[PDB]
Ligand binder design. Structure first.
Ligand code: F43
Ligand SMILES: C[C@@H](OP(=O)(O)O)[C@H](NC(=O)CCCCCCS)C(=O)O
Ligand SMILES: O=S(=O)(O)CCS
Lengths: 259, 442, 550, 442, 184
């Protein structure tokens, strides 16, 4: 068949982007945050109650016979009619292990039935609540995709992806949802992602050391690794741009001879 | 005749219908079914008789939240629906045997009127149907219930909302699939002003049929806008054939191959099929081992990518059973495909930009709304020439009820009236039939 | 290393611009800013006096503002700093007058009127009669009523900004006319520019009417043309006394105020329903011609950057952040293009690279030069963002960064080739290269037109093709999103600054906005915005004489 | 048949052609000639090759006084003309037995292109003609002269001109008789866009033929606007027959009877003919004499008054040999008739109101333009439903060159293009023949 | 020359009425948020600060001078007497107090048990810009106040639902647009 190559380039950042894009690549496990702690950090529901429902379970409701719709297996949260909630992150520009477009591409190539959006300041995923919690805890939190110092889960007032880190190597946060504790070195979350305070702070673990961050980040930087050091990615980008321009002008094989 | 490439034809269930069909057989300029659909969409008008009765009984004329005390008429339109329909048919009939029909819908609660084509031959545009039906309704209501001469104004305001003052039928009880010509955002955009919800409700939430309806409308519009002439015609012909009628069973094949898959798996399937069919070849191998691809057939590659985009939307929004993933899927299918192959996206990035704006205005405060309120005439989704709306229709068909602005909320009268015609309800099979009819003429 | 933006970063930030760490949450919140404290004191006084206790401004709700250091803003090529609140278009009278002066301008040609007067109407037309007509229209345009005391007239002090001016490409007629109300092309433009403009204009005469600002304040932009036409007709039938019939007067009226009318903007269709002379109808070439820096500067980068500043202040702030969205607005995005010398530094590097490699205009527009120039400029800009953490803090939003880098790339390409569509193609390549570099771009829907752009830059389809000079806010791709249009106008100007052109799209607009009688001087838009941010700009349209003092 | 009305058809010389012709034989919904004229108007486009060459040579792209330095293309469009025409026809061609006429005008400086009807059967409006022609012209110009990839935008601006930004064709060199549907006064107003000067130039300043052209266009438009539906259809059919097509020879008879007369004498002859034909009777005689008159046939009286209005305009403007009298003639014809008989005027005062519009539009400093640029698609002239415009055509045909807006100044290209069609040059004769061909089907 | 006529036109121009019932239904059935009169009071407090041009989210904003927007009000009225009882009278347009008994009853019967918000954007906004600015200004500020008063995500599908409701579904304009020839 066809063996995918995900991204171009031979630098370390290109390899990390390929690993994030690759669904057969096992993300390294770094933390162990229990499901209740993650659920209470998201702040959508209290751990212990039943899932709220936005529409009756798919078995109860009746649908028209659609052959091309019923041959795609739905998520477990979809057949239970669970409501669609979100998890949102801000990734620092200083060697955060995951980056907005990288996160969106990896999520869309790894998860089923998710809605991913990317900005400069934040990246958000929306899915059914049960599936969202499951994949969030299993992939987004206790893997290399999350750094408690350079990445924080923020639902509103996202600001600090481009600001300088503070004296603890920690991202700026206006609401101060997560706090660095000096007497242990651990980072503790004192509020939910929206900003509502928690009853008890939840420990998310130690921050990743900077040296490790350098070799697992997916961002090109003049100090870490420059895009000038990966000419293949630039060449591919220029080829895509030229192909777009030629197709916009006249979409024929003769025009594409000047590719 | 001028295009040597043939296509196969598969139904909505993936069964073969015919092979070696010329590409031009599905062309809007040749296919009889597409011509019939365009002719019938211009002359069919939906009438809300119950809405008229309710508006007149409470004096609810004037649009949103507006009442005129004293201008209240107590009529029984729904009970006398047969008489009203007979009078409207008599008024609109041209000679004796024209295609004038006024069928009763929902026990007289709605009317589906079709003005004769003879009334549209001598008309420059399509607005004659709505105005003629409005006048016929006014006369029928005035003559059935002996309405006073000083209340014909109230009747007119009940049928059309504020038309002389507002160049539209906003508060009225008369509707059509196409919008008013004053709402067009560009020249030739008349056929692009059909919202996604209207297309989904017309096809009764059938995914493949909704895709076919939306694609046929969008590509016929591109023909009308002058975009699909000259060297741009083959690209749109292939886009309609592959993304919209699953010519080589590409859409069903990709969905079947990715029943429990993600968007990336659909991208991989699309690239594998394109390589197997010879559409794309390896241009060069880079230093890092990246295999840059080039299209051996540019338009065929575009068609393959569009079919894969429809399949990816179907897979993702069927896994989620929610129609809010459409914009993300359309964006990231193209985004992953381009940097996996080095090839341009579905519409040379024009579908990606439409998906970006769709994501923006479907997730922010600046406008837009649910995916069902967008159309090809919308300022946000007008940018891709018929390659982005059929996926939106498929996704809204796959929805399980997580959207408030669902087809039921938005298109109740239009959907119920236009679902009664087999050509509008199942466009896919009738377009295939027309292509089969004109198969041997090329 | 020496950078043009270094001095502003030194002034704005207390730490070293290369320093990667700082401290937060120690500034006292909104109290750290004098503007916010003034706003609080005002809000208290207004609430108590005028609002009868209904709250207006409550900083204690919502985000706690000022958790970080609220930076001041320089203005490019100007040595004066201001807070970000002073640059809001509602708080800045200079930006409001910038839009007012463009809104209230209509140019009408008077050669068909003269020919109809001479031949059909049998009335002689001489420079003395032209001077008499100019006197009449100058009295009558603001609010006047000629020799009719019984007619209601507008208070003269209410329309002190209303003028009627004349200019012509005919030299002898120009020097025979009164200099009180003449826009002299010869003494306002350099010799070669004046010759080019006179050749483009011809031997024709044009009158410029500046409707008073108050008229546009009370009404909309479509009022300006009607006001101008009515006053022109009255003045024409009052100055020249004619004994012909009324039908000949109708022909003369068409010739005089419905024949050679030039408007600033066109009407918009659909959901953008608007009349003429609204900022969404102004094409990029027209805005380039409005700005007059080609008159007083030979530097192409400065000429492009003044148009960038004006286009940002108009399109991003007024048009998009008020006419189309409203609320606090999109001031951020626009100030990013003209506050510090960041875009100046990037554009100067792009010009230097083009001059060293291809020459000032030494290459024909090909794909290869577009790709290499755009890639080089984008890489330089992104590494500048990388190695100066204070710079990244200054341009905190991804959009403001993307727009600046892409504008530098497009200006560089336009310098190299002299083609505006090549420049916009370079802009789009820069945008996608930026996205791949930083794994980031602007907001959610910032790159709708940047993914659609490459294909639409050189397209020939009906709704996709247009020269960048003929594009504008109503171009379908550019209709909605912020952070593009002002830079597009700058790129369109840079296409012609490379060739040393006297104008970009319309000579008449250039000459008309060279007028010294305008309140906002378009020779230095950045300086005037700086003056307005300091509350030292004298704007028009104030109803001080018809309001109580208490 | 549903109308028992019969008419006798007379040619432009006052000779009898046929008798007892059914009134619906001249209906827009039945008459073949009116159908053919509507189709030809929809599908015909005029191209100014000399204008394109001049605009490109000087870089004069833009609306008015606009010119882009550096974007100048030096091509010989007029010199070749035929390679361009052949390429445009080849691009626009749909089939072999296909209309697609592209014809050379004025020795190469103009093109008269007729888009095939196949491209208009699948279009919701008429705008496909200009867009398709513009695209074909752009492709032909880019292919014939090897235009660089970076100048196609310049070519587009020269052909269409500001279109994406400014939603029309302002500075372009391509034109059609119908304007953009987004720029209409109301719904269905597309056909009331041809000015009086265009009608006069097309018919070569023939009074009866220009009257027939204007009346046919106006009444077909009323049929399109929904106005001529039901009870109003008879009034508009009679108006067309008696005001445009000289039915019963009323217009010629009134003109002959008032060769040396005034408007008052025309009113007298109209009333005498109406009395003699049984159209009006005596209502009652008041105390001070003045026998009041009531119409025994309301629609026929309106038609007689309309024919008399045309005759009065002809008489007054042939006495003065100037076309500036139309407004006053219509206004005071209606006034004198009303206060002479106690009867309503033409169109129940709408003709008089439109005449007031004409007066204040062409007779003051707040006037604008002259009578030659009158059309029904204006805010000032829209109020009469095809009863006030056709007489202006007679007025402008009678003008002896004393108007600034003469047909030669404003409609030279229009006359050169549309005078080639027989149904446009002599609308009266061919409409009469078409009505004769369908006499027996009623 | 008459500031009263200018203010008449300004007050008519700057008024937009928004029906805040569909938004409440979205908050209740999609976001699972409970709407009570206390939450409505908090929302009114928020929007009276946000509509003139104050900042609620997105750290580091600039704000318009309160002196230029002293005429900017966000008012609420309802035909539901029970809900109107426990509403902050500062932001309430009381139908009972402003209208005689019979007229108040007629108005309540016509309006029904529905809640509406009246936004009066500053006159300076309509004077700098045109009249088409008002609805968009009100819609943006309404969306911002909604997402900051109920502690929601700053941007999701429900945000689009709010935006669409406040932009056209539940909005009442003083004057309709005039596209085409009229061009306004
Ligand atoms: C709530 C929204 C959704 C939306 O439609 N607009 C918001 C908010 C809105 C409000 C701010 C209301 C207030 O002051 O509280 C306004 C002013 C629009 C308006 N007229 O109401 C605005 N943004 Ni936004 N907005 C901006 C920006 C940005 C950048 C911030 C970069 C970052 O640090 O993360 C990001 C986009 C991103 O995804 O990257 C952004 C997002 C967002 N922006 C997100 C989420 C905000 C969050 O922090 O929770 N703005 C900027 O990049 C600077 C310019 C700035 C605009 C105002 C100005 O020019 O001063 C402002 C423009
Ligand atoms: C898309 C459309 O919104 P609607 O859904 O039609 O209301 C359109 N808005 C805009 O253009 C918003 C532009 C300004 C805010 C976004 C700048 S990034 C408009 O108001 O007509
Ligand atoms: O972030 S959003 O794209 O919602 C708008 C930015 S102001």
């Amino acid at each position: 068949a066809y063996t995918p190559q995900f991204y171009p380039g031979a630098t370390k950042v290109a390899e990390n982007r390929r690993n994030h894009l690759n669904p057969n690549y096992e993300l390294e496990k770094l933390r162990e945050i229990p499901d209740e702690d993650v659920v209470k950090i998201m702040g959508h529901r209290q751990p212990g109650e039943d899932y709220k429902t936005v529409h009756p379970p798919l078995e109860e409701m009746d649908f028209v016979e659609d052959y091309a719709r019923d041959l795609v297996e739905p998520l477990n949260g979809a057949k239970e009619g669970h409501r669609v909630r979100y998890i949102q992150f801000a990734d620092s520009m200083y060697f955060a292990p995951a980056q907005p477009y990288d996160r969106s591409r990896s999520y869309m190539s790894r998860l089923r039935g998710v809605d991913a959006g990317t900005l400069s300041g934040r990246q958000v995923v929306e899915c059914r609540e049960s599936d969202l919690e499951e994949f969030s805890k299993n992939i987004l939190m206790d893997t290399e995709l999350f750094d408690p110092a350079t990445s924080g889960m923020r639902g509103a007032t996202v600001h600090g992806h481009s600001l300088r880190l503070d004296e603890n190597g920690m991202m700026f946060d206006a609401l101060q949802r997560c706090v660095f504790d000096e007497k242990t070195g651990h980072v503790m979350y004192v509020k939910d992602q929206v900003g509502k305070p928690l009853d008890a702070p939840v420990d998310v673990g130690e921050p990743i050391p900077e040296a490790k961050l350098r070799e697992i980040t997916t961002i090109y930087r003049n100090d870490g690794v420059a895009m000038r050091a990966d000419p293949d990615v630039i060449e591919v980008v220029k080829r895509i741009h030229r192909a777009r321009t030629l197709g916009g002008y006249i979409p024929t094989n003769e025009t594409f001879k000047g590719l | 005749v001028k295009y040597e490439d043939k296509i196969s034809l598969y139904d909505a269930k993936g069964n073969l219908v015919a092979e070696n069909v010329p590409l031009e057989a599905i062309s809007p300029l040749y296919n009889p079914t597409i011509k019939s659909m365009v002719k019938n969409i211009k002359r069919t008008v939906a009438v809300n008789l119950a809405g008229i009765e309710g508006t007149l009984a409470a004096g609810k004329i004037g649009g949103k939240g507006c009442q005129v005390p004293g201008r209240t008429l107590d009529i029984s339109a729904v009970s006398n629906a047969q008489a009203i329909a007979d009078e409207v048919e008599k008024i609109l009939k041209v000679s004796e045997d024209d295609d004038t029909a006024v069928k009763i819908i929902n026990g007289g609660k709605q009317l589906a009127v079709q003005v004769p084509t003879a009334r549209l031959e001598v008309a420059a545009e399509y607005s004659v149907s709505m105005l003629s039906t409005a006048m016929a309704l006014k006369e029928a209501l005035i003559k059935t219930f002996n309405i006073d001469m000083f209340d014909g104004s109230t009747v007119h305001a009940a049928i059309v909302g504020n038309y002389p003052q507002v160049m539209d039928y906003a508060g009225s009880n008369i509707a059509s699939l196409l919008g008013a010509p004053s709402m067009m955002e560009g020249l030739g955009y008349a056929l692009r002003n059909i919202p996604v919800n209207h297309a989904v409700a017309t096809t009764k939430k059938n995914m493949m049929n909704a895709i076919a309806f939306s694609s046929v409308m969008e590509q016929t519009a591109t023909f009308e806008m002058g975009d699909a002439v000259g060297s741009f015609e083959r690209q749109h012909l292939l886009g309609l054939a592959y993304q919209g009628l699953n010519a080589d069973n590409l859409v069903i094949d990709f969905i079947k191959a990715n029943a429990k898959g993600t968007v990336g798996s659909v991208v991989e399937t699309v690239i594998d099929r394109a390589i197997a069919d010879g559409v794309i070849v390896v241009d060069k191998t880079m230093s890092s081992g990246f295999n840059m691809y080039k299209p051996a057939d540019v338009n065929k590659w575009n068609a393959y990518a569009a079919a894969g985009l429809v399949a990816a939307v179907a897979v993702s929004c069927g896994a989620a059973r929610a129609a809010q993933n459409v914009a993300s899927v359309i964006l990231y299918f193209n985004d992953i495909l381009e940097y996996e192959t080095g090839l341009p996206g579905v519409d040379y990035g024009r579908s990606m930009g439409t998906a970006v704006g769709f994501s923006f205005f479907s997730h922010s405060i600046y406008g837009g709304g649910g995916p069902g309120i967008f159309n090809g005439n919308h300022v946000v989704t007008r940018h891709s020439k018929g390659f982005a709306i059929p996926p939106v229709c498929a996704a809204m068909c796959a929805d399980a009820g997580t959207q408030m602005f669902s087809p039921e909320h938005t298109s109740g009268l239009v959907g119920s009236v236009y679902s009664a015609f087999d050509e509008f309800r199942e466009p896919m099979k009738y377009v295939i039939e027309g292509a089969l009819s004109i198969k041997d003429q090329f | 290393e020496k950078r043009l933006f270094l001095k502003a970063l030194k002034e704005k930030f207390e730490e070293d611009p290369k320093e990667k760490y700082t401290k937060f949450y120690t500034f006292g919140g909104w109290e750290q800013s004098a503007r916010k404290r003034e706003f609080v004191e005002a809000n208290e006084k207004i609430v108590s006096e005028k609002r009868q206790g209904i709250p207006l401004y409550n900083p204690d709700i919502g985000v706690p503002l000022g958790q970080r250091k609220l930076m001041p803003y320089k203005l490019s090529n100007t040595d004066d700093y201001c807070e970000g609140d002073d640059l809001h278009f509602l708080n800045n009278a200079a930006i409001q007058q910038l839009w007012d002066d463009i809104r209230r301008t209509v140019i009408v040609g008077m050669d068909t009127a003269h020919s109809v007067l001479e031949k059909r109407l049998g009335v002689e037309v001489t420079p003395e009669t032209i001077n008499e007509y100019m006197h009449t229209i100058n009295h009558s345009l603001p609010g006047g009523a000629v020799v009719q005391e019984h007619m209601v007239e507008v208070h003269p002090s209410l329309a002190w900004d209303c003028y009627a001016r004349i200019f012509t490409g005919d030299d002898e007629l120009a020097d025979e006319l009164d200099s009180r109300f003449l826009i002299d092309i010869n003494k306002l433009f350099p010799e070669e520019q004046a010759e080019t403009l006179k050749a483009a204009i011809g031997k024709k005469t044009y009158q410029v009417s500046r409707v008073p600002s108050l008229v546009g304040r009370v009404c909309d932009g479509g009022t300006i043309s009607r006001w101008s036409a009515m006053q022109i007709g009255m003045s024409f039938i009052t100055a020249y006394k004619l004994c012909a019939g009324e039908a000949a007067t109708a022909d003369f009226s068409y010739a005089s105020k419905h024949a050679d009318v030039i408007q600033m903007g066109n009407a918009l269709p659909g959901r953008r329903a608007r009349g003429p002379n609204e900022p969404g109808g102004i094409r990029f070439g027209i805005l380039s011609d409005v700005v007059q820096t080609t008159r007083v500067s030979e530097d192409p980068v400065e000429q492009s950057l003044e148009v960038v500043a004006t286009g940002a202040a108009l399109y991003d702030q007024i048009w998009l952040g008020a006419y189309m969205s409203g609320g606090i607005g999109f001031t951020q995005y626009a100030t990013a293009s003209y506050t510090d010398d960041i875009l100046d530094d990037f554009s100067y590097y792009a010009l230097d690279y083009v001059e060293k490699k291809y020459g000032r205009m030494g290459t024909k527009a090909t794909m290869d030069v577009v790709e290499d120039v755009a890639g080089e400029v984008t890489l330089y800009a992104l590494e500048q963002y990388d190695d100066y953490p204070a710079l990244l803090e200054d341009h905190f939003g991804g959009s403001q960064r993307a727009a600046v880098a892409a504008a530098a790339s497009g200006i560089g390409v336009c310098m190299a080739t002299g083609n505006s569509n090549a420049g916009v193609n370079g802009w789009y390549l820069s945008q996608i290269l930026h996205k791949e570099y930083h794994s980031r771009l602007g907001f959610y829907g910032y790159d709708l037109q940047d993914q659609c752009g490459a294909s639409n830059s050189l397209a020939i389809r009906n709704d996709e093709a247009a020269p960048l000079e003929l594009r504008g806010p109503n171009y379908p791709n550019y209709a909605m999103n912020v952070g593009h249009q002002g830079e597009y106008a700058g790129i369109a100007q840079a296409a012609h600054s490379a060739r040393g052109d006297a104008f970009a799209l319309n000579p008449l607009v250039k000459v008309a906005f060279a007028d010294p009688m305008l309140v906002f001087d378009f020779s230095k838009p950045r300086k005037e915005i700086a003056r307005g941010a300091l509350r030292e700009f004298e704007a028009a349209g104030e109803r001080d004489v018809i309001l109580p003092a208490k």
